[PDB]
Design a protein around this nucleic acid. Structure first.
Length: 97
DNA sequence: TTGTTTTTTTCTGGAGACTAGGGAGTAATCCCCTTGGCGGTTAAAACGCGGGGGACA
């Protein structure tokens, strides 16, 4: 049959909140880090541990930001997060101007 | 029958070349290593379709 929209989303929320493994596949993230670093200094080498630490910090920060975004969206009587939500959360945080 | 002497035998400066080996230099080969190709394995990001839900007024 068909699951009504919004139920499988709750199932994934339950699934991913019980687990800790990283949600971004490694190699694209590593290539993105390498590209970003290249603009600061050339012919650079990275320890896999450094790259893993970068991924852990980035994913945790993104999860916290998504939590704040969901809270902001709920405050607007809304269920869907939209860019203004991220913007407001970042603004109140003080990272974005 | 013994010992002194005779005699025999053993011992006692310069030039013009050549080759051959050792240290340093170059480059090459075999083994290993890095990288790319062939062969297999498929979950999923994107795209489509259809329907439920809420954003906005």
């Amino acid at each position: 049959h068909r699951y009504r929209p919004g139920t499988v989303a709750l199932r994934e929320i339950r699934r991913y909140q019980k687990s800790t493994e990283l949600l971004i596949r490694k190699l694209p993230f590593q290539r993105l880090v390498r590209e970003i670093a290249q603009d600061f200094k050339t012919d650079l080498r990275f320890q896999s541990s450094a790259v893993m630490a970068l991924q852990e910090a980035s994913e945790a920060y993104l999860v916290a930001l998504f939590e704040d975004t969901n809270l902001c969206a709920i405050h607007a009587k809304r269920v869907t997060i939209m860019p203004k939500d991220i913007q407001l959360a970042r603004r109140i945080r003080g990272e974005r101007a």
